[PDB]
């Protein structure tokens, strides 16, 4: 994919955001911003320019399922890639997110290779 693709990394834990951002850099992606919950995320997304969202689920203010659903329902950003990265491991969680339009889904804890693999799976599906 285009190495100037702008990512929004959303998680209420700064340690996780740091992990994801550093994995993105290793993969060649340096245009990366962070948000701390779904409301902060939507503020940055409204600010413009984003091409990919990586998001947690359990966050205050707006959780990642609501964030995903808001994005998919919004005409200005309905096809924006959203990769879920969450400790929610139950099949019903995965179903709710998949059905809500998740581009992909990774369960914490996760390896570097898994994130890379699932990002590349989304790129290939979208022809990025
Ligand atoms: F708090 Be997240 F769903 F890992
Ligand atoms: Mn969380």
């Amino acid at each position: 994919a285009d190495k100037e693709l702008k990512f929004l990394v959303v998680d209420d834990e700064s340690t996780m955001r740091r992990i994801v951002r550093n994995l993105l850099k290793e993969l060649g992606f340096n245009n990366v911003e962070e948000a701390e919950d779904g409301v902060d995320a939507l503020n940055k997304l409204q600010a413009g320019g984003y091409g990919f969202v990586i998001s947690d689920w359990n966050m205050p203010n707006m959780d990642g399922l609501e964030l995903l659903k808001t994005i998919r329902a919004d005409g200005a950003m309905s096809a924006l890639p959203v990769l879920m990265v969450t400790a929610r491991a139950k099949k019903e969680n995965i179903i709710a997110a998949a059905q809500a339009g998740a581009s992909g889904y990774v369960v914490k804890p996760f390896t570097a290779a898994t994130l890379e693999e699932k990002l590349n799976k989304i790129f290939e599906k979208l022809g990025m």
Side-chain angles (χ1 to χ4, degrees), residues 11-13 56-59 85-88 108:
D11 199 295
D12 57 331
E13 292 180 276
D56 188 31
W57 190 321
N58 296 332
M59 307 178 286
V85 178
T86 172
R88 319 268 297 215
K108 303 173 182 180

Side-chain angles (χ1 to χ4, degrees), residues 19-30:
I19 288 162
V20 176
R21 182 200 271 277
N22 277 99
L23 289 172
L24 284 172
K25 173 173 166 168
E26 179 63 32
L27 289 179
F29 304 104
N30 299 289

Side-chain angles (χ1 to χ4, degrees), residues 39-87:
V39 175
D40 197 35
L42 286 160
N43 281 149
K44 297 191 170 199
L45 291 178
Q46 132 242 108
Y50 292 88
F52 207 112
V53 178
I54 301 174
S55 184
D56 188 31
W57 190 321
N58 296 332
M59 307 178 286
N61 292 330
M62 185 196 283
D63 74 37
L65 213 218
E66 288 286 296
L67 173 62
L68 168 60
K69 292 174 176 176
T70 308
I71 290 163
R72 285 270 171 280
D74 194 289
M77 57 181 172
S78 64
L80 195 57
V82 182
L83 177 59
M84 308 298 302
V85 178
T86 172

Side-chain angles (χ1 to χ4, degrees), residues 9-20 34-37 56 58-60 87 108:
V9 172
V10 190
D11 199 295
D12 57 331
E13 292 180 276
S14 93
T15 292
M16 192 51 54
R17 299 203 300 278
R18 207 138 190 177
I19 288 162
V20 176
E34 294 183 26
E36 67 186 4
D37 62 45
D56 188 31
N58 296 332
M59 307 178 286
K108 303 173 182 180

Side-chain angles (χ1 to χ4, degrees), residues 83-101:
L83 177 59
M84 308 298 302
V85 178
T86 172
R88 319 268 297 215
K90 306 186 196 283
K91 300 310 185 156
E92 288 306 323
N93 296 330
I94 306 169
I95 290 153
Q99 287 298 137

